[PDB]
């Protein structure tokens, strides 16, 4: 985190400032914070037929929510990088994180970590990168096979098949949602929300906070595009206190001939800090100072 570039700064809501510098208390990342790096890979496909899912241990680990977190998305795009499952240099594309947030966690029938109880907030990107799903449902594991209701469970993941749902004929609105429905059953859904995302390779910033008014979703796509300032675009009516979140491992089922390189996104915790924000003439914050 570099505060001199105003990285991860959430813009104030309902007002703007011009050509003045203010000190503010809010939820900002710490300067020089390395954060947590998450990489999404491509599944096993030896022949140009699909196979297993190549994921990491992101689903098993449970992270405290605290005051929220901010996500840096697609900062390594437009660059030559290696596919994770192999050693093939490819152009890095942008991938959107998938989240699972809740207020109580336990174990599955195996005894492995996970198993969010009662109403669980799901932030699943869809549309092959052009749609965001916000769901608030009770998560119920399905039995049989590798699903978490039978005693051989390994991990749960979200998969996409680009030669089926990323085609130019149309974009499957329910791709990652139907992939997620194969592991858990969605019951007693409080709300289902859909947000449209424009397809581009620009770097993005995503934030999420919580207070008495609900869960607030911030994105640099709204407002300061081609920038880093994050503006509020959604207020989910999630009034129970979120205590934990988990990054859902999202592995793409692509062939050997049509593999792709996907960026690594970074998650930084938010803290109740004081920041000196520098507002420009157009109102966007271009530099900041972390007083601590």
């Amino acid at each position: 985190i570099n505060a001199s570039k105003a990285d991860g700064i959430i813009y104030p809501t309902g007002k703007s400032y011009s050509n003045i510098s203010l000190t503010l208390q809010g939820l900002f990342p710490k300067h020089g914070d390395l954060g947590e790096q998450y990489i999404y890979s491509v599944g096993h496909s030896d022949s140009n037929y699909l196979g297993k899912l190549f994921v990491s241990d992101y689903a098993t680990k449970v992270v405290p929510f605290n005051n929220g977190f901010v996500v840096r998305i697609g900062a390594a795009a437009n660059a030559t990088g290696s596919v994770i499952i192999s050693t093939v240099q490819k152009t890095i594309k942008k991938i959107y994180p998938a989240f699972m947030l809740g207020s109580s966690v336990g174990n599955f029938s195996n005894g492995v970590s996970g198993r969010y109880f009662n109403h669980t907030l799901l932030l699943l990107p869809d549309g092959c990168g052009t749609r965001l799903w916000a769901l608030y449902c009770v998560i119920e594991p399905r039995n049989g096979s590798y699903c978490p209701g039978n005693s051989n469970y390994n991990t749960f993941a979200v998969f996409d098949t680009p030669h089926t749902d990323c085609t130019s004929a149309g974009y499957n609105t329910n791709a990652t949602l139907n992939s997620f429905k194969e592991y858990f059953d969605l019951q007693n859904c409080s709300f289902i929300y859909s947000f449209n995302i424009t397809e581009d390779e620009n770097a993005e910033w995503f934030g999420i906070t919580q207070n008495t008014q609900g869960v607030h979703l911030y994105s640099s796509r709204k407002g300061d595009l081609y920038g880093s300032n994050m503006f509020l675009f959604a207020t989910l009516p999630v009034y129970d206190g979120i205590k934990y979140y988990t990054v859902i491992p999202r592995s793409i089922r692509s062939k050997y001939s049509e593999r792709q390189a996907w960026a690594a996104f970074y998650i930084y915790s938010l803290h109740k800090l004081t920041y000196l924000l520098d507002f420009s003439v157009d109102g966007y914050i271009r530099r900041a100072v972390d007083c601590g």
Binding site: S16, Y17, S18, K222, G223, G283
Partner: peptide, 9 residues
Amino acid sequence: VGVKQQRFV
């Protein structure tokens, strides 16, 4: 001056 989508400066 300022951000337009924020109605007030």
